[PDB]
Amino acid sequence: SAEDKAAVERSKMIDRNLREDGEKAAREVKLLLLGAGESGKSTIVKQMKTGIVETHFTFKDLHFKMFDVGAQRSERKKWIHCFEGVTAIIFCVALSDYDLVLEMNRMHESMKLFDSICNNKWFTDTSIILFLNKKDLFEEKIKKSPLTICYPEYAGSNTYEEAAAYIQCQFEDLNKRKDTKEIYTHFTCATDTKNVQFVFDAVTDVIIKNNLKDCGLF
Amino acid sequence: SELDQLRQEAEQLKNQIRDARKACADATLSQITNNIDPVGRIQMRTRRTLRGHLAKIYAMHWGTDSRLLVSASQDGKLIIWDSYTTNKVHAIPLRSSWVMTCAYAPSGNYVACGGLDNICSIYNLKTREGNVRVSRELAGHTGYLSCCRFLDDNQIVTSSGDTTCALWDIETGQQTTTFTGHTGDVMSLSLAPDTRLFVSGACDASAKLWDVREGMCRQTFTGHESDINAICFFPNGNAFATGSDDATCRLFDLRADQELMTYSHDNIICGITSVSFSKSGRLLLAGYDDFNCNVWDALKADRAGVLAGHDNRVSCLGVTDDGMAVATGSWDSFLKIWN
Amino acid sequence: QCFYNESIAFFYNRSGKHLATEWNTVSKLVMGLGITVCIFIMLANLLVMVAIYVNRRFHFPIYYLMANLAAADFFAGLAYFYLMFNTGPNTRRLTVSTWLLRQGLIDTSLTASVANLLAIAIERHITVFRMQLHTRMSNRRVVVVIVVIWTMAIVMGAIPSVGWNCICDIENCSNMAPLYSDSYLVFWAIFNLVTFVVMVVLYAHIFGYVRQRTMRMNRDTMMSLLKTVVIVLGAFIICWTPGLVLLLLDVCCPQCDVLAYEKFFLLLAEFNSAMNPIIYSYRDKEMSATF
Amino acid sequence: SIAQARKLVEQLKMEANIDRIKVSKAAADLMAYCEAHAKEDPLLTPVPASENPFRE
Numbered sequence: 058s059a060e061d062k063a064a065v066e067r068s069k070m071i072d073r074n075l076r077e078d079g080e081k082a083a084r085e086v087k088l089l090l091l092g093a094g095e096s097g098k099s100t101i102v103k104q105m106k107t108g109i110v111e112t113h114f115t116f117k118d119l120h121f122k123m124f125d126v127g128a129q130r131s132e133r134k135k136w137i138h139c140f141e142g143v144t145a146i147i148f149c150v151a152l153s154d155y156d157l158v159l160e161m162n163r164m165h166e167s168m169k170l171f172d173s174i175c176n177n178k179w180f181t182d183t184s185i186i187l188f189l190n191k192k193d194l195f196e197e198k199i200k201k202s203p204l205t206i207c208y209p210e211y212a213g214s215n216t217y218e219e220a221a222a223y224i225q226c227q228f229e230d231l232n233k234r235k236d237t238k239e240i241y242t243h244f245t246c247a248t249d250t251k252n253v254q255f256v257f258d259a260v261t262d263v264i265i266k267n268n269l270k271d272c273g274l275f
Numbered sequence: 276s277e278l279d280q281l282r283q284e285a286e287q288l289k290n291q292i293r294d295a296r297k298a299c300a301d302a303t304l305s306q307i308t309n310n311i312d313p314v315g316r317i318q319m320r321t322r323r324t325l326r327g328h329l330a331k332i333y334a335m336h337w338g339t340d341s342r343l344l345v346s347a348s349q350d351g352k353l354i355i356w357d358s359y360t361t362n363k364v365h366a367i368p369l370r371s372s373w374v375m376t377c378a379y380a381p382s383g384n385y386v387a388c389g390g391l392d393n394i395c396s397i398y399n400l401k402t403r404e405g406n407v408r409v410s411r412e413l414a415g416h417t418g419y420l421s422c423c424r425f426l427d428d429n430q431i432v433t434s435s436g437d438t439t440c441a442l443w444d445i446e447t448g449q450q451t452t453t454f455t456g457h458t459g460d461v462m463s464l465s466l467a468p469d470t471r472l473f474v475s476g477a478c479d480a481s482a483k484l485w486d487v488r489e490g491m492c493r494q495t496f497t498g499h500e501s502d503i504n505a506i507c508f509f510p511n512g513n514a515f516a517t518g519s520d521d522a523t524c525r526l527f528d529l530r531a532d533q534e535l536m537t538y539s540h541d542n543i544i545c546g547i548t549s550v551s552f553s554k555s556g557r558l559l560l561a562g563y564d565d566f567n568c569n570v571w572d573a574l575k576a577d578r579a580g581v582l583a584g585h586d587n588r589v590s591c592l593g594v595t596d597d598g599m600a601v602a603t604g605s606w607d608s609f610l611k612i613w614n
Numbered sequence: 615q616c617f618y619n620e621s622i623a624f625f626y627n628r629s630g631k632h633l634a635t636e637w638n639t640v641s642k643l644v645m646g647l648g649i650t651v652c653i654f655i656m657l658a659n660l661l662v663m664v665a666i667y668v669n670r671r672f673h674f675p676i677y678y679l680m681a682n683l684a685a686a687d688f689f690a691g692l693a694y695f696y697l698m699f700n701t702g703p704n705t706r707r708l709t710v711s712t713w714l715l716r717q718g719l720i721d722t723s724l725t726a727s728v729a730n731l732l733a734i735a736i737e738r739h740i741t742v743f744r745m746q747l748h749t750r751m752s753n754r755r756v757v758v759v760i761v762v763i764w765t766m767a768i769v770m771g772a773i774p775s776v777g778w779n780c781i782c783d784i785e786n787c788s789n790m791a792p793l794y795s796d797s798y799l800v801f802w803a804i805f806n807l808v809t810f811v812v813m814v815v816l817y818a819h820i821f822g823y824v825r826q827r828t829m830r831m832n833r834d835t836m837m838s839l840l841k842t843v844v845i846v847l848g849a850f851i852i853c854w855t856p857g858l859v860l861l862l863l864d865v866c867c868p869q870c871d872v873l874a875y876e877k878f879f880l881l882l883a884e885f886n887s888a889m890n891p892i893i894y895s896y897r898d899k900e901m902s903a904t905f
Numbered sequence: 906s907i908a909q910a911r912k913l914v915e916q917l918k919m920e921a922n923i924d925r926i927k928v929s930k931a932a933a934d935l936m937a938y939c940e941a942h943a944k945e946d947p948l949l950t951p952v953p954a955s956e957n958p959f960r961e
């Protein structure tokens with residue numbers, strides 16, 4: 058009974074440290090980085106700052122963690138449920154692949170992956186930040202190759218703005234929970250370096266809306 | 276030409292194996308066990324509850340002493356508890372918050388864990404300083420580590436989603452042996468009492484019995500209609516049980532090379548995450564995604580109780596070597612001891 | 615010194631009020647309207663409470679504060695119902711103790727209602743200005759504010775009976791509450807006004823913060839939030855302004871016609887209690903459906 | 906995929922050659938080992954609280 062009490066103090070200290078760590082980690086935004094192969098996700102990671110990679114950074118007194126699982130190459134259906142509760146899902150897609158083929162168009166594969174992730178039973182209330190990279194290449198390629206290669210239903214002049222807006226709508230139309238979740242789109246810009254600002258603003262809006270939802274101010 | 280004749284030979288040999296399994300099947304388990312009397316309802320109440328985890332619990336394991344246990348949570352914590360006094364003995368912070376398995380060495384000196392990091396982290400508890408330290412970090416797998424069990428104090432068997440398993444020597448750090456043959460992500464494994472053989476289950480709806488020394492596969496067992504999430508070994512060492520996502524458990528035999536009993540119910544459609552046997556092998560405790568665990572009579576396939584004390588998916592289930600308790604851990608961040 | 619031996623007739627004659635021992639049309643009219651409002655308040659708040667109880671989704675601090683507000687409104691309705699069947703002619707038979715108790719019940723009930731409104735505003739301001747997701751529950755704070763609310767209400771209700779009354783200083787009595795003093799009226803009015811301005815400030819800060827940090831990015835949340843805020847504030851204003859004005863006139867202006875519109879103003883202040891639940895439980899679709 | 910088929914066949918050959926005993930004997934041995942350890946299973950036969958460390 059003499060030494061049996063020190064275990065109680067050890068347990069109390071362990072619980073205090075656990076509570077402190079939980080309070081420290083609860084105020085850290087969590088982002089899941091996804092995207093089909095041969096995308097601009099590496100560029101995003103570089104702009105921010107062998108199975109899974111973690112990138113921690115800070116912006117305007119707000120800490121963010123980004124988890125990349127590109128080196129898994131396994132059945133996603135088994136481990137996708139591990140990222141439940143993350144603050145957002147950053148989905149990267151390159152437009153330049155609208156005509157490239159890996160057979161099949163990589164754009165259709167990216168759209169299938171987006172439909173599988175967004176409409177997943179685990180991610181029913183998480184927000185998605187869509188990064189349509191390779192804006193310059195897609196703007197300079199449409200001048201010769203039309204968008205009809207992938208989207209034959211498209212009808213419009215071969216211009217950057219029209220085709221980009223059409224692709225944005227096509228990617229946003231795959232969402233089914235139009236009211237539970239919202240999708241934030243941003244065409245990546247390298248010169249301005251505002252991607253982190255966009256992510257910060259999106260996360261802030263998400264948090265504010267959740268708070269309003271929680272205190273009866275729907 | 277070669278591919279066609281090889282395919283035909285494989286098909287004919289599989290048919291021959293089927294005919295052999297059929298010929299050796301003269302009766303069924305239930306028919307021989309109809310004379311024995313049931314054991315009745317098994318009522319087990321929560322005797323202790325463990326709190327402290329701030330996120331989902333993904334795995335646990337009991338020690339040889341049947342008193343200390345371990346549990347990993349997505350919060351980046353691996354907690355070692357004392358079941359008797361529900362006192363948090365150890366709390367190790369992981370460099371990666373993605374962990375999906377735990378292992379307590381039989382000697383109790385080392386512990387292991389792994390997950391999406393694809394590394395098996397061996398921690399030495401009995402260090403001179405008194406503060407746990409990462410003893411080793413086994414790498415080489417090309418997928419997530421699903422299960423790991425300490426075969427000894429220096430060797431360890433691990434399974435990954437790369438469709439292979441690996442026996443490692445902790446000291447050297449290199450794969451002592453590699454086991455291939457599976458066509459899907461291996462999700463669970465179980466060691467035999469003698470440690471000379473071990474069975475592994477994958478998402479290909481098939482299990483395989485591998486030998487350690489020779490490094491070859493002895494037998495392959497089928498029958499499931501979906502992935503295999505858990506698997507346990509019978510104490511006698513001559514049979515095992517497998518749990519899948521199709522809401523069904525199945526008992527396979529080694530010598531007979533055929534299934535014996537199927538534990539399933541029409542009212543259950545949820546998946547299975549963990550299964551365990553009693554010290555006598557009469558009972559079979561299986562955790563489901565219906566927020567509860569079910570106790571089946573191995574020799575009769577009749578439910579003998581229901582453990583309903585969790586508000587979320589039951590992720591892990593374990594039984595001690597003594598057989599005087601059962602531990603259950605769920606995504607609700609709570610562990611519960613029964614009887 | 616203190617005139618505890620005299621009857622209620624002396625107190626009512628010292629002022630300009632009239633006993634009216636005989637029944638009258640206005641008395642029956644106000645009694646009917648009051649009992650109607652009381653049954654409405656009680657039914658609505660009991661429905662809110664049972665809905666929060668049966669449904670387990672509403673097990674958060676905000677819903678606990680809403681349930682406490684509903685209970686306070688139910689208590690106010692019960693106190694107003696007890697005030698009926700005891701006013702006008704029956705007032706001629708009540709003694710000092712019964713009179714003080716009757717007034718203190720209404721006082722404590724309405725103070726509890728106002729304090730619950732203020733606490734709801736504070737909790738909303740807190741929950742809006744956090745920067746975390748999946749925050750853990752903390753019932754200690756809501757329990758603490760609830761007990762503080764009820765203690766302050768009971769204190770404001772018991773104070774007038776214990777020592778603070780016009781029994782020992784008759785020269786300065788109220789014209790509507792002959793036994794109560796005017797200092798208590800001023801204190802109550804100041805408390806109400808500070809609570810109201812605090813609520814307004816908090817909600818305005820909330821609106822500004824939300825607008826600023828969501829302008830950079832189907833239905834616009836700005837319009838809905840503005841509507842909710844303006845409604846919450848306007849109900850309070852239209853339901854508690856004339857009563858405060860009447861108390862202020864009673865304490866400040868002699869020879870003012872104050873004894874006329876007191877009962878209507880009290881009825882309006884009570885109808886505030888019926889408006890509160892429908893105001894704080896109509897946006898929530900799940901709450902409405904639970905009914 | 907000649908090497909893969911070769912390895913698969915060479916592996917299944919070892920599975921084809923097994924000294925399998927009748928399933929009746931398997932069930933008999935299972936029931937025997939299950940009945941010979943009945944007194945040793947606490948859960949199957951609840952032990953008095955005096956011997957349960959999880960009670961007192």
Ligand SMILES: CCCCCCCC/C=C/CCCCCCCC(=O)OC[C@@H](O)COP(=O)(O)O
Nearest residue numbers: 701702705721790791802857876877879880883
């Ligand atoms: C005048 C109404 C103001 C609005 C309601 C808020 C009152 C909150 C309480 C504040 C403490 C001081 C209140 C003094 C005025 C209360 C007058 C009153 O509520 O009496 C009830 C009256 O009918 C019946 O009078 P009798 O027929 O003589 O019994």
